[PDB]
Design a protein around this nucleic acid. Structure first.
Lengths: 177, 116, 94, 69
RNA sequence: UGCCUGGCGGCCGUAGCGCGGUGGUCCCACCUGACCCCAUGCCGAACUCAGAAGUGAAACGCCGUAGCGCCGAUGGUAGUGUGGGGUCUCCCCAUGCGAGAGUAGGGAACUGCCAGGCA
RNA sequence: UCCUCCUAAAGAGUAACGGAGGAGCACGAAGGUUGGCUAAUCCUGGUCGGACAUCAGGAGGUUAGUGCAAUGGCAUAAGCC
RNA sequence: GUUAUCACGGGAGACACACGGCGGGUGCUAACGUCCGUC
C-alpha cells in the first residue's frame, strides 16, 4: 500500500508514457516475489536448514515452506523425499514492505557492487538472480549469523518479454549494469 | 487456467452420474452472476433454468451476486422443480467448494421441500 | 510432336490387370481437374520404346484416345521391382 | 499353463446379465452402457441384449456397449 | 428473429498447433484484507464477501492465414480363399475379397436446448 | 509347482528334449472413503557445481513412475499430498 | 439337404498312424532334415 500507491502514481505513468500503451493495465503488474535457499549442504546437517528457515521467517512476514527432492542422481548421492531447502512466497503487503526495505538500504550497500544484470532473464521477463553474503540485509544481525550463506531472489511479474523487465528496471532507476 | 481446472474437477461427478442416469441439478457461480439449471439424464435437455442476471428474479435482490441472491435462486429453482415434477433429482455443485453461496443455495433448495 | 495412341478401358480389377500383363499390355490412369479420372489401355513394347526417350521427364504427352487429343503429364510410374516391365502410369491433365 | 485370453463374445451377439464379453489382460477395451469392469479388468454385462463395439475418444480407444433387445 | 457472449450435450487431430487482427453492448477476466463462509504441507497455495475504482491485458470468444498438422477417393500395387500347371527355395493360369502408401478432393468445421446483450 | 513374449498362420485354442526369464515374497499400510496436486530430459541465472545436491522461469507430455522378472493397461489416473 | 442339429438311457472300438496339399517354428534365410494349425 505505502509503496503501491507511489508505484501506481509514478511508475505506471512513466511506463505508459514511454511505451505508448493503450490498455490501462497493459503496464506490467507484479505477481509475487520468491526468496529461496538452495545451498544443498543440508545433507551434512539439518539444524542449519531450520535456522535459515527461522531467519527467513523473521526477516519476512511469513514462514518459508520446505522443498523436497525433485530427482535423484547417483553422482551427488541424494535420495527422494529428503528436504534440502525452503522458499518464501511474498504476496501483498508483506512483499511490498520487504521489497521497499530491501531497495531502501540493502541493495546500495554491498561489497563489490558491480551492478545488477539487465540481460540475465529467463526469457519471458522474470528477473531471477542469486545473491550471496546474507549479512547485507539489515535483519540478519551478528548475534544470529551462523555462516556466510546465499539466497535466490526472483520477482514474478505478469510480463511476457524482456522489454517489460528492462522498463521495470528503468522505473527502479537501475543504478548501473 | 481456472475454468479448465473447474471443468476437469466437475468431470468426475459428471461422468459418475452417467451410470446412474438420473436428472441432476447443477449451478454455475461467479462473483458477478449465478446460473442454475436442472439437466435431464440424457445430458442435453434442461427442464428448468435461471440466472441472476435476469430481472424477473433479481428485482428483489440488491444485486445479482450475493449470498441472499444465491439463496433466492436456489429457492426459486427448487420451487419450479417441485411444481414441474422433477421426481427427486440428484445434486451437482459443478466442481465448486461447498461452503459459500453454493452451500446457501443448496440448503435453500433442501428446505424448499426437496429430499436430496 | 510426339505421337501417342491409346485404347478404351472397359475392364477393371486384378483379373483385368493380370489379363493385360499376360497379353503384353498394362493400364494407366489420368486424373486431375473437375473431370472424373479415367483408365486407359496401352501396349507394352511400344510404350517402352516411347519411354526410352530422355525428354519424357519434362515433355507434355499428347494422348490420342477415341479420336481425341488430350495434353497430360506423367507424375508417377509404378515400375516392376526388378524386371524391366511396367504395370501402371499416372497422368495429370496439365 | 497358457492363460486364456481373447474376446469371449463378439459384437452383434446376445448376452445376459453378468456375462463376460472379453477377459483382457489389461484394458484394451472400455465399458460403455450396461457394461461393468471388474477388479480383474474384465468387462461383464449388466443386462440382457446385443453387444456392440465402437471406437471414439482422443486416443481412439475401443468401447464395448450393450443395447437391450 | 439478424449479430455477439456464457452454460448444458453430441463428434473426438475437417474441431488439432504456429502467426496477425478484433472484443467490452451483456457475459467472462484482473483487486484489498479477511479476526468474519471456507483453510493452507507458510502463503487467500486452490475456492468465498463488497463490485466496478478502473481495463480488454496473461488467459479467454470470434475472423483470416491451407503455414505446420489431419481426414481422404476412383484406380493401381503387394497379399489371400478354391481347381490346375511350371525349370516346385518360388512363379503363373480362371475366378472372389482386396492393402499400406500416394494423388484429386475436404476443410480454419458442424449440430439440439437454455441464459444475457445491440436490434 | 506357478507365472511373462514368441513360436501360435489379422476370432479362440494350438505342440517338440524350441528359442528367452522371475517367484515361494509382501500390509494392521503399501487398503477404502473424501478434498486436492500432477511426469524423465534439455535450456536461462546460480561462492559451493566437476555437465550430472536443489533452487526462480521456459520447452517437454508419459521414453518417468506405477514395490518384485516380464506382459497388458494407468492423465479422469491404477502416480503423490 | 430323408432333421443332415441338439438332449438322456445301454452297448461299443482305439487310446503307437504313414504319405501328400496348404501357412508357419527349430535348423546355418544349407534343404527335399525335424515339429506344429487344417484338408
Amino acid at each position: 500500500a505505502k509503496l503501491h500507491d507511489y508505484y501506481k502514481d509514478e511508475v505506471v505513468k512513466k511506463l505508459m508514457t514511454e511505451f505508448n500503451y493503450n490498455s490501462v493495465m497493459q503496464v506490467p503488474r507484479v505477481e509475487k516475489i520468491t526468496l529461496n535457499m538452495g545451498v544443498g549442504e543440508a545433507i551434512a546437517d539439518k539444524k542449519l536448514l531450520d535456522n535459515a528457515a527461522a531467519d527467513l521467517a523473521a526477516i519476512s512476514g511469513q514462514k518459508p515452506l520446505i522443498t523436497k527432492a525433485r530427482k535423484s542422481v547417483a553422482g551427488f548421492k541424494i535420495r527422494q523425499g529428503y528436504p534440502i531447502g525452503c522458499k518464501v512466497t511474498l504476496r501483498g503487503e508483506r512483499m511490498w514492505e520487504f521489497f521497499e526495505r530491501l531497495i531502501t538500504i540493502a541493495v546500495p550497500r554491498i561489497r563489490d557492487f558491480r551492478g545488477l544484470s539487465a540481460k540475465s532473464f529467463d526469457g519471458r521477463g522474470n528477473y531471477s538472480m542469486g545473491v550471496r553474503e546474507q549479512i547485507i540485509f539489515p535483519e540478519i544481525d551478528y548475534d544470529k549469523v551462523d555462516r556466510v550463506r546465499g539466497l535466490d531472489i526472483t520477482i514474478t511479474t505478469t510480463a511476457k518479454s524482456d522489454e517489460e523487465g528492462r522498463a521495470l528496471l528503468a522505473a527502479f532507476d537501475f543504478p548501473f549494469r | 487456467d481456472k475454468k479448465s481446472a473447474r471443468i476437469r474437477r466437475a468431470t468426475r461427478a459428471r461422468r459418475k452420474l452417467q451410470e446412474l442416469g438420473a436428472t441432476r441439478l447443477v449451478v454455475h457461480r461467479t462473483p458477478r452472476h449465478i446460473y442454475a439449471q436442472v439437466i435431464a439424464p440424457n445430458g442435453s435437455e434442461v427442464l428448468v433454468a435461471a440466472s441472476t442476471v435476469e430481472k424477473a428474479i433479481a428485482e428483489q435482490l440488491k444485486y445479482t451476486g450475493n449470498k441472499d441472491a444465491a439463496a433466492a435462486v436456489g429457492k426459486a429453482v427448487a420451487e419450479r422443480a417441485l411444481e414441474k415434477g422433477i421426481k427427486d433429482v440428484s445434486f451437482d455443485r459443478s466442481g465448486f467448494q461447498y461452503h459459500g453461496r453454493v452451500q446457501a443455495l443448496a440448503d435453500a433448495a433442501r428446505e424448499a421441500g426437496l429430499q436430496f | 510432336m510426339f505421337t501417342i495412341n491409346a485404347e478404351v478401358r472397359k475392364e477393371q480389377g486384378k483379373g483385368a490387370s493380370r489379363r493385360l500383363r499376360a497379353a503384353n499390355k498394362f493400364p494407366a490412369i489420368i486424373y486431375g481437374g473437375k473431370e472424373a479420372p479415367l483408365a486407359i489401355e496401352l501396349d507394352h513394347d511400344k510404350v517402352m520404346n516411347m519411354q526410352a526417350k530422355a525428354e519424357f521427364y519434362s515433355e507434355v504427352l499428347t494422348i490420342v484416345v477415341d479420336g481425341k487429343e488430350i495434353k497430360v503429364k506423367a507424375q508417377d510410374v509404378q515400375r516392376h521391382p526388378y524386371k524391366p516391365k511396367l504395370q501402371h502410369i499416372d497422368f495429370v491433365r496439365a | 499353463e497358457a492363460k486364456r485370453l481373447g474376446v469371449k463374445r463378439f459384437g452383434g451377439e446376445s448376452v445376459l446379465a453378468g456375462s463376460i464379453i472379453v477377459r483382457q489382460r489389461g484394458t484394451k477395451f472400455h465399458a460403455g452402457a450396461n457394461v461393468g469392469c471388474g477388479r480383474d479388468h474384465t468387462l461383464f454385462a449388466k443386462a440382457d441384449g446385443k453387444v456392440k463395439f465402437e471406437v471414439k475418444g482422443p486416443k481412439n480407444r475401443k468401447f464395448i456397449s450393450i443395447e437391450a433387445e
